[PDB]
Amino acid sequence: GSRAVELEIDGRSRIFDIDDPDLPKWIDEEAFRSDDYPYKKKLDREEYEETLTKLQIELVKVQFWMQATGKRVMAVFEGRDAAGKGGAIHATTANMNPRSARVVALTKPTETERGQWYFQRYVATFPTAGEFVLFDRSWYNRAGVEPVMGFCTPDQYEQFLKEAPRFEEMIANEGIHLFKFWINIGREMQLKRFHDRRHDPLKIWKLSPMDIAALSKWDDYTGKRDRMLKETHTEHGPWAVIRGNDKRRSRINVIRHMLTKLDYDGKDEAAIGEVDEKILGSGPGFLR
Amino acid sequence: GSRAVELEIDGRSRIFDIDDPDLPKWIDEEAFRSDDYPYKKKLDREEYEETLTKLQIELVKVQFWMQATGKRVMAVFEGRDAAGKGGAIHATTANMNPRSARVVALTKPTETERGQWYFQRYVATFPTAGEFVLFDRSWYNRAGVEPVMGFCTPDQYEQFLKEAPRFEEMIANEGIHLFKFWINIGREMQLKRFHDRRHDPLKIWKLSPMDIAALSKWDDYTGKRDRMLKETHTEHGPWAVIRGNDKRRSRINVIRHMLTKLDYDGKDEAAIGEVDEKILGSGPGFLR
Amino acid sequence: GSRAVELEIDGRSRIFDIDDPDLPKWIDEEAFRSDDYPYKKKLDREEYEETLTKLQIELVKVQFWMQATGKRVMAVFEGRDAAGKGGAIHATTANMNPRSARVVALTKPTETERGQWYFQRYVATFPTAGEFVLFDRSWYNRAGVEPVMGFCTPDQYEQFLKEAPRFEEMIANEGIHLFKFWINIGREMQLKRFHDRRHDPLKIWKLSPMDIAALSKWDDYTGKRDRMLKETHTEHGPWAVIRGNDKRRSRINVIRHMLTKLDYDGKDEAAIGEVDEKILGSGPGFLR
Amino acid sequence: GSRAVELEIDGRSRIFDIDDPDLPKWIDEEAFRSDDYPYKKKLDREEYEETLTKLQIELVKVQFWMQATGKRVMAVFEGRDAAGKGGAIHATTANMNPRSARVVALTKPTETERGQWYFQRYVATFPTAGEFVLFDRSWYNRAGVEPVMGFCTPDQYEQFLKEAPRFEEMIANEGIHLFKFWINIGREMQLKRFHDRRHDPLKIWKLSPMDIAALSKWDDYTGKRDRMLKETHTEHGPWAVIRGNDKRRSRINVIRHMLTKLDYDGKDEAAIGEVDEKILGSGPGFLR
Numbered sequence A, B, C, D: 001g002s003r004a005v006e007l008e009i010d011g012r013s014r015i016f017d018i019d020d021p022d023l024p025k026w027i028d029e030e031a032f033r034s035d036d037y038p039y040k041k042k043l044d045r046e047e048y049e050e051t052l053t054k055l056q057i058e059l060v061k062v063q064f065w066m067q068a069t070g071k072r073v074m075a076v077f078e079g080r081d082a083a084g085k086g087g088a089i090h091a092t093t094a095n096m097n098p099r100s101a102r103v104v105a106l107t108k109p110t111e112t113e114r115g116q117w118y119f120q121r122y123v124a125t126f127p128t129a130g131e132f133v134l135f136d137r138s139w140y141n142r143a144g145v146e147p148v149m150g151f152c153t154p155d156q157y158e159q160f161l162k163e164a165p166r167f168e169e170m171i172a173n174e175g176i177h178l179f180k181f182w183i184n185i186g187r188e189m190q191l192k193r194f195h196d197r198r199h200d201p202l203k204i205w206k207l208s209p210m211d212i213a214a215l216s217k218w219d220d221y222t223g224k225r226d227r228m229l230k231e232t233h234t235e236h237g238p239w240a241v242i243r244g245n246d247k248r249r250s251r252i253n254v255i256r257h258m259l260t261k262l263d264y265d266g267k268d269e270a271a272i273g274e275v276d277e278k279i280l281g282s283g284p285g286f287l288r
């Protein structure tokens, strides 16, 4: 295998060939149970849909209340590569008005942007009255992919970790409600999903040069993740941390978290349910 | 009862009360067959999803070919209110990369924009290399909703009809491939969809005072549609015109049309299928 | 007089008619010496031109140093209406490259802009590598003209005073050198300059309804000045405060200040000269 | 002595060393009379200022009329390097309100801009109601500096020549008044000004590597000028062509031309005077 990589999965030497259509047993058997996942089987499709429908009905109410009051929301999505960021975003926006809820998904910075204040091109996307803005990756590029891949210098990395709390304090002081979600998955789950994307012609667009590099960089991402959650989890900018091995439970609890934190007119606490504390936690210390 | 309207439906007076949860039989019985619709029943869902999957797999190939060549695509979506243009956009973008495929859904112009060249704020959204940009409504606001609702003057309307072909001639000469889709529905189908949206807590966001006002302005929108298709169907900017009573057949044939017109790498004509000529036609005079 | 205003000049009732082409003696004879001005006559024109020329030669060096190193500079100009903000900006940019030094002169916020984070439209103007950005009025609109005329609420005013220091902390931590200049003049000098502009067909455009109304708001503007200087003079964003009764001395010492604070290659200490401490001071308490 | 270039001056080899402080007599003696210049001596300095003052008083009237009517103006400035475009722009804007009259001086395109429609980044600077926008260079980069220096391909060059008339047809049809000014100078005048800029510490910022390369490329620019004037001078976008050897006469007739073409309230034709038809002509053929 040309793209096959060697990996150290706790003392054990493993080879992963993403192009091999056959998934080996040590990934197949451990993918769902990795990352101390609390559930034995994934949430059934029809129970997920019944619950998600009820949650999206509540988000329609949220949007109506935001147009009426002018309230603005920003929701940041980050995590392990292949953890399910885009799916949590689509589950949130599926039944929202595209003229008042929009997704930010920026590309690599231009020469002009690289010479700007790092946050400038993100401020350009900030919401006006009533808008719900969701970030498919965010300024937290500089706390993960950029230092791991050397797209920013160590000093730029250290600088970003000191400025992000200041940036988000202004956001919160302005009255924009800022959500930050870190969607985690276990190591073998990431391998399984890279394999799934590689061998599905409908999903192979999800598999980028970055992800193939992320394979040998698991521990470095772990370090950057831990460092980032500990140093940028502040009162003004709290991190909600998700065990995301089950995409369905991930999406449901992301949305439950936002509904509970918003004091929107018409809110039906029965339809929201409870955030599963086994799936969604706060700040550092949630992931072992 | 507070918003019931009296309508003239092909010679007879009819009452439509959108807030009445019961749909009148004269709407429910005629909605699907309205607008000379060529089929007796809905396309089967399972068949539709199987076909949509093959089309989205081709759209992955399209996006790969656009990235490698730099080719750019713009897809304009217009039509009768409630004809499902957002549904056609989601079916196109569901498995495309949000960093290279994006949706434009502008809100009403600010005072600054109203004093600008009408087209300026649309040029601001134009694609860079490899981008696929989809317009959920477009500069064709000024050929429909604006003149019907008096948001632009008649001089401004007549000016737009003359200037849009010149605008699209420059788009086409730049080598951006411009698709324009008009999705039609029959009058009874519009009422049924308005009613369904009003009484579904998940879809009530899809209604707006613009829609509410469109109830009493059917014949006005008809003439604005005819005038616009006549005056702005050109070689450089041709209109693809859709009988959209069946949302599944609408979405499939929209995507098939684009796949047929794009000469992309890896194109599988057997997977694409044939554009259904009973559903998708060209220019003025296809619809009655 | 159609728009004559009655004023109280230290317990004495005075009447100022700006449309009267005759300036009264009490304005003409006290204009230059108001605000405890330290010099008895205005600076000799030839000496001013010789000095400004040397100073603009140093600014040429500054611009070359900024292109090579990438250093970015922002210069904010606020003051009494008619104090000479544009003249200080023109003296600074007269021999600078328009592609790397630019002036920001925003108009009143659009509806979209009013629903945004107040600072958003100002971040959009921030410099990329090498750029010198000057603000002909700035975000400090909300600490002066906006509360005085009621274009913002008391709550928005108090919020700005808390947030402007945090905003400029981020600017300073980014390594953009931010200058802030308050150009003060005496009351009678303001009256004289309004009069001069009213009766000069070349300068009448400088007279706006905001200035006509400022005629009666002298004391209100005084309090806003004092409050804003004390609460937004910080280590990260220091205020330079200028006695501006003499436009020539105002322009020279503004530029001297910036030349002294920038550590640019080729700095000719002898060319810069001494900042006149009788003209330019730091922070509150300089004016009285 | 480093970057001396050999030039062919109508049958003779000449050496020009821009770094030599002494200017050769063959340049000095021919500079003002070059380009079939029709006057023996430059315009009297005090007479120029008196005329310019009266023209700028007329431009105040223009601005007030544009504010009241919403009328918009765009003024494009191109010409030989060192012809004085920036000087003509400052003479127009010196006594205009910088909140409604603004200068566009774009830098080289980003990667993103290079993948866009060439005109898109210029459309982003178009005027809203009442604005007067001046271009210090324009989209005509692609008919001059870009093809001469190889920053665009021949296909892109030919495409621009065909598309610029279509672009300006839409500008004119929109009711924006578009002026295009080509400021020409003689070859020895250009060498003289280059030499003057190089050896004046106040103006050396006016030189660029682009200017240095222009030295050896005079004949290329001559053809590029003539092609552009022939192919893009149209009814909707006419070129005003200036003999600019005397910068005072260039500035005055540029402004006179605009005042003549604008039907503004309070127009005083005696103040405007007559455009000097020996200095300012129309389209190709005016220049040798």
Ligand SMILES: Nc1ncnc2c1ncn2[C@@H]1O[C@H](COP(=O)(O)OP(=O)(O)O)[C@@H](O)[C@H]1O
Residues within 6 Å of the ligand: A106, A107, A108, A109, A137, A141, A145, A146, A151, A206, A208, A209, A210, A211, B097, B099
């Ligand atoms: N050369 C680069 N410099 C800075 N950021 C980059 C660079 N290349 C990729 N990125 C960013 O890293 C993140 C991951 O990139 P990629 O995997 O290629 O696409 P996606 O995130 O959509 O899956 C993106 O936000 C991307 O813009």
Ligand SMILES: Nc1ncnc2c1ncn2[C@@H]1O[C@H](COP(=O)(O)OP(=O)(O)O)[C@@H](O)[C@H]1O
Residues within 6 Å of the ligand: A097, A098, A099, B106, B107, B108, B109, B137, B141, B145, B146, B151, B206, B207, B208, B209, B210, B211
């Ligand atoms: N006052 C207005 N002036 C101009 N355009 C308007 C105005 N109000 C609404 N519109 C436009 O009419 C179109 C239909 O409005 P709406 O139904 O709310 O959007 P949507 O397509 O998402 O349902 C939108 O493009 C909207 O911007």
Ligand SMILES: Nc1ncnc2c1ncn2[C@@H]1O[C@H](COP(=O)(O)OP(=O)(O)O)[C@@H](O)[C@H]1O
Residues within 6 Å of the ligand: C106, C107, C108, C109, C137, C141, C145, C146, C151, C206, C208, C209, C210, C211, D097, D099
């Ligand atoms: N209605 C308003 N709301 C907010 N700001 C305003 C409003 N009107 C004027 N301003 C601002 O007050 C400042 C003074 O403007 P003005 O005196 O009218 O003209 P200028 O600043 O060009 O001399 C400007 O920055 C202006 O944008």
Ligand SMILES: Nc1ncnc2c1ncn2[C@@H]1O[C@H](COP(=O)(O)O)[C@@H](O)[C@H]1O
Residues within 6 Å of the ligand: C099, D106, D107, D108, D109, D137, D141, D145, D146, D151, D207, D208, D209, D210, D211
């Ligand atoms: N590498 C480049 N590519 C395209 N345009 C450029 C490039 N370099 C300079 N220019 C443009 O050429 C013109 C001359 O530059 P300057 O003399 O520096 O004003 C300006 O419009 C520049 O933006």
